[PDB]
PDB file of C-alpha atoms in Angstrom:
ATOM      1  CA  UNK A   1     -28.602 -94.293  11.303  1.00 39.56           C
ATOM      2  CA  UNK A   2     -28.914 -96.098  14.855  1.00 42.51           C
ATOM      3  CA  UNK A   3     -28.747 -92.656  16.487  1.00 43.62           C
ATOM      4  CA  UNK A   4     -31.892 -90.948  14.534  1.00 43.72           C
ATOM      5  CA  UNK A   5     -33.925 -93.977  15.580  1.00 44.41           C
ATOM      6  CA  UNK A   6     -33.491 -94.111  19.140  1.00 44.36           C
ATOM      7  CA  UNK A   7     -34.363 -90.139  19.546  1.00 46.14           C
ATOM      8  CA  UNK A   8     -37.246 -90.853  16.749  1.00 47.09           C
ATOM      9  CA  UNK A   9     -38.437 -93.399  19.841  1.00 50.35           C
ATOM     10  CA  UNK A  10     -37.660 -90.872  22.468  1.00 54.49           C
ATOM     11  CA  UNK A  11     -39.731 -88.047  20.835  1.00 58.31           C
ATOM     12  CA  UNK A  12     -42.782 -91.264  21.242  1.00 61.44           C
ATOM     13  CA  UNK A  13     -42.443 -92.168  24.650  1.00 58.85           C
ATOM     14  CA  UNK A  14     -42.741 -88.218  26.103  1.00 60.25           C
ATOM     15  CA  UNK A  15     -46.133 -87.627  24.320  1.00 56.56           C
ATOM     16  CA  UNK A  16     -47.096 -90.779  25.951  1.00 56.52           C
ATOM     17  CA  UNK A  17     -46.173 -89.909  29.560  1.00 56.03           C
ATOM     18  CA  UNK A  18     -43.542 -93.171  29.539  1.00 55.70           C
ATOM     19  CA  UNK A  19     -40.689 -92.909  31.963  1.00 57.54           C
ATOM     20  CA  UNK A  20     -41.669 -88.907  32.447  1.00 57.96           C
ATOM     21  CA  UNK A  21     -39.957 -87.701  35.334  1.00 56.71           C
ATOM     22  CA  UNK A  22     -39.943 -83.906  35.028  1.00 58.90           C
ATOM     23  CA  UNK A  23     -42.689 -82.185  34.366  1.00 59.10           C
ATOM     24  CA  UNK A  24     -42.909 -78.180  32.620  1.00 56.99           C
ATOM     25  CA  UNK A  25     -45.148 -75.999  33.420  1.00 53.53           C
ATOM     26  CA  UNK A  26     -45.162 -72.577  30.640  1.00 53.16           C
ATOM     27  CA  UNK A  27     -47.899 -70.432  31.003  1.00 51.72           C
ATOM     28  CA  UNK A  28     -50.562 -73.757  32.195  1.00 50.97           C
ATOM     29  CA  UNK A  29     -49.465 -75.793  29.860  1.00 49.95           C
ATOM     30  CA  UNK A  30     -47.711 -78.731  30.720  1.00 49.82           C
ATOM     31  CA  UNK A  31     -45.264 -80.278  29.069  1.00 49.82           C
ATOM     32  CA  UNK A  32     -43.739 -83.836  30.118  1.00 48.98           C
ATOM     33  CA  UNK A  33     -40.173 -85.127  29.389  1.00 49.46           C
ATOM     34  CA  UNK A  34     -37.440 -87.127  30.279  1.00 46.62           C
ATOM     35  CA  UNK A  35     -35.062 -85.552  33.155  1.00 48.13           C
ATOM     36  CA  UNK A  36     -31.934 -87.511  31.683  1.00 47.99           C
ATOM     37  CA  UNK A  37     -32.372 -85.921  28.095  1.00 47.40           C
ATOM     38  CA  UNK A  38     -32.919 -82.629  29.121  1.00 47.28           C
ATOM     39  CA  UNK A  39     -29.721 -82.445  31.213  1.00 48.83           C
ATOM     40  CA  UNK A  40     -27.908 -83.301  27.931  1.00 53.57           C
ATOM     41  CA  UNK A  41     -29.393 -80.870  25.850  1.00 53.74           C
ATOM     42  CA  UNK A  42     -29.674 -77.849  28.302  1.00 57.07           C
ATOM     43  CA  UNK A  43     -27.418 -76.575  30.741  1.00 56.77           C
ATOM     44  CA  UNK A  44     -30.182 -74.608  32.852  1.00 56.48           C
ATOM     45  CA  UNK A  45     -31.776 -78.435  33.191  1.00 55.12           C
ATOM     46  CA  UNK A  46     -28.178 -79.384  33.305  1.00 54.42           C
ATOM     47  CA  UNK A  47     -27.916 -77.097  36.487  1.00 53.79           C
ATOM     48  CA  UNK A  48     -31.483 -77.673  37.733  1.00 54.77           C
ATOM     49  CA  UNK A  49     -31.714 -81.389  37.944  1.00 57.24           C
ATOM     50  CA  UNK A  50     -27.947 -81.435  39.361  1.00 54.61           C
ATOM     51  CA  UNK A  51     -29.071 -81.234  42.499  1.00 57.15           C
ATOM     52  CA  UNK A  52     -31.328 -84.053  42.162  1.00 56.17           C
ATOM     53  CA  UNK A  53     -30.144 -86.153  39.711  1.00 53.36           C
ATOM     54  CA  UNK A  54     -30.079 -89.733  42.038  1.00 51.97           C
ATOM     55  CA  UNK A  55     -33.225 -88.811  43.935  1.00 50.71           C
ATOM     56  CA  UNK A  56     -35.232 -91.811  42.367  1.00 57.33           C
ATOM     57  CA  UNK A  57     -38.617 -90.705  44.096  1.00 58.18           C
ATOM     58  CA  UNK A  58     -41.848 -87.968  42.689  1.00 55.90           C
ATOM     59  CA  UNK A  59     -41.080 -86.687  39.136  1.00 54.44           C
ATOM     60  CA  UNK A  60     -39.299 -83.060  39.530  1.00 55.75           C
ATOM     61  CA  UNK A  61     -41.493 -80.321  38.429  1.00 53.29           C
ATOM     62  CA  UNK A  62     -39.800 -77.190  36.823  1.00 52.15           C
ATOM     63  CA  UNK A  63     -41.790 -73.995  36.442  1.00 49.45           C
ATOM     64  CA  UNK A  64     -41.308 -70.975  33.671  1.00 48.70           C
ATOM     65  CA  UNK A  65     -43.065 -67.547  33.571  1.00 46.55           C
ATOM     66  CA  UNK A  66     -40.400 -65.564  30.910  1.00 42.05           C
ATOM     67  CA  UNK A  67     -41.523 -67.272  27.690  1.00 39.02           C
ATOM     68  CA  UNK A  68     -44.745 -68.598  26.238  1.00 36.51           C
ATOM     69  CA  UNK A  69     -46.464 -72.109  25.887  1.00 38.50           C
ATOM     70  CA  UNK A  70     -46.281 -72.005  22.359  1.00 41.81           C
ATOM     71  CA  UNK A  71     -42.660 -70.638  22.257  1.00 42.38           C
ATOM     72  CA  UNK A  72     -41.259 -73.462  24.301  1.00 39.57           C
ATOM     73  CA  UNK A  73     -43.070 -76.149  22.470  1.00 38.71           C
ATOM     74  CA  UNK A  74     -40.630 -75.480  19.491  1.00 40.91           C
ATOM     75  CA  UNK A  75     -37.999 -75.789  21.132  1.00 44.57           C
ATOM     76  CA  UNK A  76     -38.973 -78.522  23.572  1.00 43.49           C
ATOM     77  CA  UNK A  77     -39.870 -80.665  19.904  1.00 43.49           C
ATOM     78  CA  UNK A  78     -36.208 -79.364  18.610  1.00 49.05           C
ATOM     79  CA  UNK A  79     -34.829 -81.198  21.466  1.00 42.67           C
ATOM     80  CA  UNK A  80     -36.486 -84.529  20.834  1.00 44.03           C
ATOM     81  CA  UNK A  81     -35.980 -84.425  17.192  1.00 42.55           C
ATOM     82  CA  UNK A  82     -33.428 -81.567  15.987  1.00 45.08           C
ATOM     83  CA  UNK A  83     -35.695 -79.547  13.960  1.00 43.45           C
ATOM     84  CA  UNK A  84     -36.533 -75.935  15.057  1.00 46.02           C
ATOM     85  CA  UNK A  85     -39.228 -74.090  12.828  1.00 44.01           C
ATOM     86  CA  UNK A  86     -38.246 -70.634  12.912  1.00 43.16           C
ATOM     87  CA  UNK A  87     -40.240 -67.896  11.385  1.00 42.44           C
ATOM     88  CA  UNK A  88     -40.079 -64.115  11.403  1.00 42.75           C
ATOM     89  CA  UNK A  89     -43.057 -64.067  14.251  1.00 42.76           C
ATOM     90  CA  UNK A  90     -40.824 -66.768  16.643  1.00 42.98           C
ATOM     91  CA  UNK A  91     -37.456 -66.191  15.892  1.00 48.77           C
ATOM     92  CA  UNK A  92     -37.042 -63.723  18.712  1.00 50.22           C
ATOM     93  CA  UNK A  93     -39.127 -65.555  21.167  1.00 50.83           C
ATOM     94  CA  UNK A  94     -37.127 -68.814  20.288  1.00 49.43           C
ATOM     95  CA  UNK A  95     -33.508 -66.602  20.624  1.00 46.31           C
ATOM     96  CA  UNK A  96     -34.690 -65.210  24.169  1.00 49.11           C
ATOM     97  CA  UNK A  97     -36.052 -68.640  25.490  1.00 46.50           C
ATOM     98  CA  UNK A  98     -33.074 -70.500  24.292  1.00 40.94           C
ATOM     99  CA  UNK A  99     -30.692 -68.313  26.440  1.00 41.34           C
ATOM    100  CA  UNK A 100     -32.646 -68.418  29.264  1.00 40.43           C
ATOM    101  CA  UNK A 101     -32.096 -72.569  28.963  1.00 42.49           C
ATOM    102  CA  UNK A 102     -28.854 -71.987  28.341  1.00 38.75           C
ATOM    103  CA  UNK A 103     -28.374 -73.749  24.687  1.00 38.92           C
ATOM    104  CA  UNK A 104     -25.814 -72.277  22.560  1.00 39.72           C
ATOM    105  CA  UNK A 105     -26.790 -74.474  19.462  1.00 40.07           C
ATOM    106  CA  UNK A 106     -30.548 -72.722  19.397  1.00 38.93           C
ATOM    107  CA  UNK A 107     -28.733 -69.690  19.386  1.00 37.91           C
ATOM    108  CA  UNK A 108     -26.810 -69.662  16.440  1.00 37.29           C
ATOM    109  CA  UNK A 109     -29.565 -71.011  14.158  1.00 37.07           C
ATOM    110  CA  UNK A 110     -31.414 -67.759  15.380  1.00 35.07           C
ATOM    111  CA  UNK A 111     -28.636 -65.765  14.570  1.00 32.65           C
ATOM    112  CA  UNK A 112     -28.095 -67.088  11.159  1.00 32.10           C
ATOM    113  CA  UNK A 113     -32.454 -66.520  10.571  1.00 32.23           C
ATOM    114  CA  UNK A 114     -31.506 -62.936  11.904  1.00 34.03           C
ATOM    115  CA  UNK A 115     -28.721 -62.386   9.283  1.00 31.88           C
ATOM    116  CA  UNK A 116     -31.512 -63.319   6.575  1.00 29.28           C
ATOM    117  CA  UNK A 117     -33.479 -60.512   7.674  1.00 25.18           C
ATOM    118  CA  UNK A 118     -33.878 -57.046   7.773  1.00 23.30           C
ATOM    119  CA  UNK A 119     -34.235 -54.748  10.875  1.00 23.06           C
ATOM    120  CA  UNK A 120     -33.775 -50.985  10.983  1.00 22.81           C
ATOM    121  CA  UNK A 121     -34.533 -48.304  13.743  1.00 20.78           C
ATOM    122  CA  UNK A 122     -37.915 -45.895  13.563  1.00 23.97           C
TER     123      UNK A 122
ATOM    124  CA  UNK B   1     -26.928 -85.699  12.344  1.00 22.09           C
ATOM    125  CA  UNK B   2     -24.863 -84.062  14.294  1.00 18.38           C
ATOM    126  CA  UNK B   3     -27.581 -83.401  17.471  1.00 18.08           C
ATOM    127  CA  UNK B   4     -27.980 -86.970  17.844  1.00 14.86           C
ATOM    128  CA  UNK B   5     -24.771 -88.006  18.108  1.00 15.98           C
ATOM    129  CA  UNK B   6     -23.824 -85.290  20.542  1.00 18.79           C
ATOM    130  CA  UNK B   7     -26.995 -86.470  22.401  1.00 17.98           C
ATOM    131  CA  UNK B   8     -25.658 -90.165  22.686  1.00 17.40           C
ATOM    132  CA  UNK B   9     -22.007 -89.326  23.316  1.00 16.25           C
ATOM    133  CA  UNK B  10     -23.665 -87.335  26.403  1.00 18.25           C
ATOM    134  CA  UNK B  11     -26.381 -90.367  27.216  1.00 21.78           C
ATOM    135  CA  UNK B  12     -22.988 -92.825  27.192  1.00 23.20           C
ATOM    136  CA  UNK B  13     -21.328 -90.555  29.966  1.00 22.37           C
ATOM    137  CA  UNK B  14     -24.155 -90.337  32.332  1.00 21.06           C
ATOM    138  CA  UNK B  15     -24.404 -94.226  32.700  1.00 19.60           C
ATOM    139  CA  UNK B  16     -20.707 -94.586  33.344  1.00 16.63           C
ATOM    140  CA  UNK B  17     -21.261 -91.780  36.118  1.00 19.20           C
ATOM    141  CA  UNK B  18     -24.712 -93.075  37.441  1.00 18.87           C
ATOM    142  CA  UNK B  19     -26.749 -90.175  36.476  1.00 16.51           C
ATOM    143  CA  UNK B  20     -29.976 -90.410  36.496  1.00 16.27           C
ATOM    144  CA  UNK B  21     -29.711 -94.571  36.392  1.00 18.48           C
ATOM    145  CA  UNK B  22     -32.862 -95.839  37.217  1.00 18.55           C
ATOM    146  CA  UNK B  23     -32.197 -99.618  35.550  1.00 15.55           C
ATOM    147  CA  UNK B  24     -29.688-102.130  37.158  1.00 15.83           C
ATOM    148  CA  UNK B  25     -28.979-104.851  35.227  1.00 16.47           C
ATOM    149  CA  UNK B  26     -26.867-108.228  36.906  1.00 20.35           C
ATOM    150  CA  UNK B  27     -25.358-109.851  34.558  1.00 19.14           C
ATOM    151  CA  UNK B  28     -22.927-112.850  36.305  1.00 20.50           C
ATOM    152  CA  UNK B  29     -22.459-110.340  39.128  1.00 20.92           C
ATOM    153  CA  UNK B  30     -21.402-107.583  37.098  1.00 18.95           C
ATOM    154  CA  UNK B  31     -23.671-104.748  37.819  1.00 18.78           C
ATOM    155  CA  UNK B  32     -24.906-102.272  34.748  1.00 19.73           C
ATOM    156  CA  UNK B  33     -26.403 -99.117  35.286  1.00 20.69           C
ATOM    157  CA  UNK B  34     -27.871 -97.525  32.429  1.00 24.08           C
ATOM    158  CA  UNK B  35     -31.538 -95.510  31.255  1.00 21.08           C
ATOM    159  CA  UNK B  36     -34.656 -97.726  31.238  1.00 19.46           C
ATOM    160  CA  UNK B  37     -36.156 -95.471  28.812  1.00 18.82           C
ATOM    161  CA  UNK B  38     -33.133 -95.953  26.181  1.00 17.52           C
ATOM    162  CA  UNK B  39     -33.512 -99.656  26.855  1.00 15.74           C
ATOM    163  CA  UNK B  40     -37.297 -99.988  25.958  1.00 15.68           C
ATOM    164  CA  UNK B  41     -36.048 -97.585  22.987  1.00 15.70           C
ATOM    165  CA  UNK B  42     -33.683-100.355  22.219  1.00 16.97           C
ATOM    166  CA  UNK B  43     -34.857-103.868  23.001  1.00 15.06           C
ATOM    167  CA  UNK B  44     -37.883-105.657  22.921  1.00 17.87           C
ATOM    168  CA  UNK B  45     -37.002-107.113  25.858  1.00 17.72           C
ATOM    169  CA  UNK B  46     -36.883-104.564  28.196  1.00 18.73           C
ATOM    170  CA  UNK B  47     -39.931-102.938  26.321  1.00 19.98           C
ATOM    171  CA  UNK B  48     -41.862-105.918  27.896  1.00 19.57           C
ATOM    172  CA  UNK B  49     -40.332-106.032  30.898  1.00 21.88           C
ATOM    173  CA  UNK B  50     -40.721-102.190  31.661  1.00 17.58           C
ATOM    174  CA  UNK B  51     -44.357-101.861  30.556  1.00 19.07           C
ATOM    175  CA  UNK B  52     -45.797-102.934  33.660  1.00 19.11           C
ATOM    176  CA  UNK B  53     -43.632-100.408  35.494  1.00 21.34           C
ATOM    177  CA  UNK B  54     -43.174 -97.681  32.980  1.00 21.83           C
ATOM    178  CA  UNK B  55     -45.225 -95.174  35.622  1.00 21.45           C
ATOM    179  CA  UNK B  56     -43.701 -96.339  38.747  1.00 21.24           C
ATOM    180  CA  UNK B  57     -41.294 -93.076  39.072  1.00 19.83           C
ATOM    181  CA  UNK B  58     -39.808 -95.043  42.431  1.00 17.28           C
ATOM    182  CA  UNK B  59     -37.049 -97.381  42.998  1.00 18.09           C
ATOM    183  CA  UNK B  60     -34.294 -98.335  40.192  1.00 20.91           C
ATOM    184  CA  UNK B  61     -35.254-101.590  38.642  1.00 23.94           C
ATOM    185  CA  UNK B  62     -33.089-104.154  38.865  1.00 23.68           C
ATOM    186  CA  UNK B  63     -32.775-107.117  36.100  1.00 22.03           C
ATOM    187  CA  UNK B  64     -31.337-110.288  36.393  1.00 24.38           C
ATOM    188  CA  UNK B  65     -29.884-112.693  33.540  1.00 22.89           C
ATOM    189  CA  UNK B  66     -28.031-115.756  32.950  1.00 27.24           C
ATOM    190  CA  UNK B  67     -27.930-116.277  29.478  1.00 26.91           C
ATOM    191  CA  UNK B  68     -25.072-114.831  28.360  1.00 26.58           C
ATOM    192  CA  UNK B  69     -22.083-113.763  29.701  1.00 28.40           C
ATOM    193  CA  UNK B  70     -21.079-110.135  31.114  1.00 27.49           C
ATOM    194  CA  UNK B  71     -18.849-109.410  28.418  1.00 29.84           C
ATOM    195  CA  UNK B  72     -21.658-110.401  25.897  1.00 32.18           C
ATOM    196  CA  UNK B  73     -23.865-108.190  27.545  1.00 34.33           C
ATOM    197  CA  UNK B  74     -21.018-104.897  27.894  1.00 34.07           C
ATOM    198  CA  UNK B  75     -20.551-105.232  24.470  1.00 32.14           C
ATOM    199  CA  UNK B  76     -23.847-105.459  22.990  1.00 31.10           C
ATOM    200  CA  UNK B  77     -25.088-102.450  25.851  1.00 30.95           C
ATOM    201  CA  UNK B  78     -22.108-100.133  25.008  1.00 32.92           C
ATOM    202  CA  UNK B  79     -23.761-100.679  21.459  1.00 34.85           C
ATOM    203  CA  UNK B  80     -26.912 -99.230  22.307  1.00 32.90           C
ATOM    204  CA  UNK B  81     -25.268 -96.116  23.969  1.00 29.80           C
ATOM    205  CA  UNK B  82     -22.575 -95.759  20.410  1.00 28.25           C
ATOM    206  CA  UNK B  83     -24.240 -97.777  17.617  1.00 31.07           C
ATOM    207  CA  UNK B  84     -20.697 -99.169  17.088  1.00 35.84           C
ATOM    208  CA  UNK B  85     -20.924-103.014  17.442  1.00 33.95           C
ATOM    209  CA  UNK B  86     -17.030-104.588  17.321  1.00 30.77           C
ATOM    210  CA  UNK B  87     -17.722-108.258  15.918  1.00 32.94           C
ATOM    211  CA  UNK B  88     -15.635-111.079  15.274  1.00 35.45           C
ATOM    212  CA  UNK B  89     -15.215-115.262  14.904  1.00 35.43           C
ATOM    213  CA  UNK B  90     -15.184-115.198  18.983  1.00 35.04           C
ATOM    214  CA  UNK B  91     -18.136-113.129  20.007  1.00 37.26           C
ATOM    215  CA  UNK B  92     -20.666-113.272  16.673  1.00 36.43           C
ATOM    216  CA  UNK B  93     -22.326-116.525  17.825  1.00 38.52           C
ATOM    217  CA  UNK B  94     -22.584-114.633  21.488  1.00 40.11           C
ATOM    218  CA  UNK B  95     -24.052-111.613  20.600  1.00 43.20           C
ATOM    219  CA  UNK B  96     -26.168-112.834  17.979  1.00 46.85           C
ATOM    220  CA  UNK B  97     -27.782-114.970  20.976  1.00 44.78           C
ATOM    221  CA  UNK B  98     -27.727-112.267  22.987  1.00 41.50           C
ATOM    222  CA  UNK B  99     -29.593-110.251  20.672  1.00 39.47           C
ATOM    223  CA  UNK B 100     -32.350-112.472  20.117  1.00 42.65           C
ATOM    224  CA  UNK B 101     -33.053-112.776  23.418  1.00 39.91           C
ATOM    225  CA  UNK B 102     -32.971-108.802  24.086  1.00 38.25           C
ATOM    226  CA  UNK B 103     -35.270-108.654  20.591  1.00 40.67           C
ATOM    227  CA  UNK B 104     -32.751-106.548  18.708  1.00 39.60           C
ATOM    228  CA  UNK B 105     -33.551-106.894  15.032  1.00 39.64           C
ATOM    229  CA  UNK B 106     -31.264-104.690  13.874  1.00 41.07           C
ATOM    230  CA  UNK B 107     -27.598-106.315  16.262  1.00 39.17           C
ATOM    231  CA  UNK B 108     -28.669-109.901  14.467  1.00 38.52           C
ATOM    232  CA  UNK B 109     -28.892-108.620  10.887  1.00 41.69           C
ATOM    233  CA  UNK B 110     -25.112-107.841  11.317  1.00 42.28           C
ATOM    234  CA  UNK B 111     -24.382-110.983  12.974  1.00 39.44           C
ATOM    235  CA  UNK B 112     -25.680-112.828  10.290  1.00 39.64           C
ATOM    236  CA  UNK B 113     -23.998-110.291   7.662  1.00 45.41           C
ATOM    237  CA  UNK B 114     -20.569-111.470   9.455  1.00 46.65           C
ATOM    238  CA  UNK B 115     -21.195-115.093   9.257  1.00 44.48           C
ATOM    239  CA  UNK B 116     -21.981-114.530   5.342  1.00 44.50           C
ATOM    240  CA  UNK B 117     -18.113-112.971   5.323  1.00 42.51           C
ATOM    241  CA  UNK B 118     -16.912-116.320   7.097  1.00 39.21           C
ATOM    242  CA  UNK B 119     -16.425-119.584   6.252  1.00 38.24           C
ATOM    243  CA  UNK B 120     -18.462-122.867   8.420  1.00 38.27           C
ATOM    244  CA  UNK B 121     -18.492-126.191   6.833  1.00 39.27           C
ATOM    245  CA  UNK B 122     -19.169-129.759   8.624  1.00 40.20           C
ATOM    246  CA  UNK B 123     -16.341-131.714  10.819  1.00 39.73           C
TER     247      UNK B 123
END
């Protein structure tokens, strides 16, 4: 119970700009976050903000050109809250960012949506 | 369930490795490191004493208190990072102190539901 509240207050303080210290740019559109969540919740940021992880100083800026602003706003709410809306339009968008990011829980719930559909070949 | 757990099992480690620790805390020497936006999260405290600096992406801030004791304090932070509070005859008038102070509703409701399962009566 404790734990669903403090990310429930998390998910607040990012679309407020509180304590953002890395920002996301995807396709303009920014998107501001906490640096110490995302290196628990993705090992790309968990390999990007290595580097710099005890450089208190400007907030890090990460840049993205190989998904779309609307793809990674899905995810970037799944991380703050644990709830990924998948569909048949975003399910492939959502697979191929997640990898990219480097989270193998994303993954599998696109899997799964995958087995409950049907693809065949022209 | 399960995310947020893993989340705060990984949030614990990085303050015990001082990653990404913006927020010192002195408690009777003992230094603290942990998140200041977990802390606001947590305490009503720290969400006042933040706000002025919630912005100020610069140095780590550094709080000072001498209130309680350091072992107060370790038990009710390592709390915040587990939601596991260990209470008992010696500490429950501690950290129920302690928890007004930080403005924790939620660490004094089970204070007080461990002094209703013990016994105080008049000298």
């Amino acid at each position: 119970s404790h734990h669903i509240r403090l990310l429930q207050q998390l998910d607040e303080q990012r679309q407020k700009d509180l304590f953002c210290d890395c920002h996301i740019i995807v396709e303009g559109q920014m998107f501001k976050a906490h640096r110490n969540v995302l290196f628990a919740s993705s090992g790309y940021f968990k390999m990007l903000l290595s580097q710099s992880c005890r450089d208190m100083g400007e907030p890090i800026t990460a840049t993205f050109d190989v998904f779309s602003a609307d793809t990674f706003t899905a995810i970037l709410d799944f991380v703050y809250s644990g709830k990924l809306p998948l569909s048949g339009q975003n399910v492939i968008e959502v697979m191929s960012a997640a990898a990219y990011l480097q989270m193998t829980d994303v993954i599998g719930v696109c899997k799964m949506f995958i087995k409950s559909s049907l693809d065949i070949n022209e």
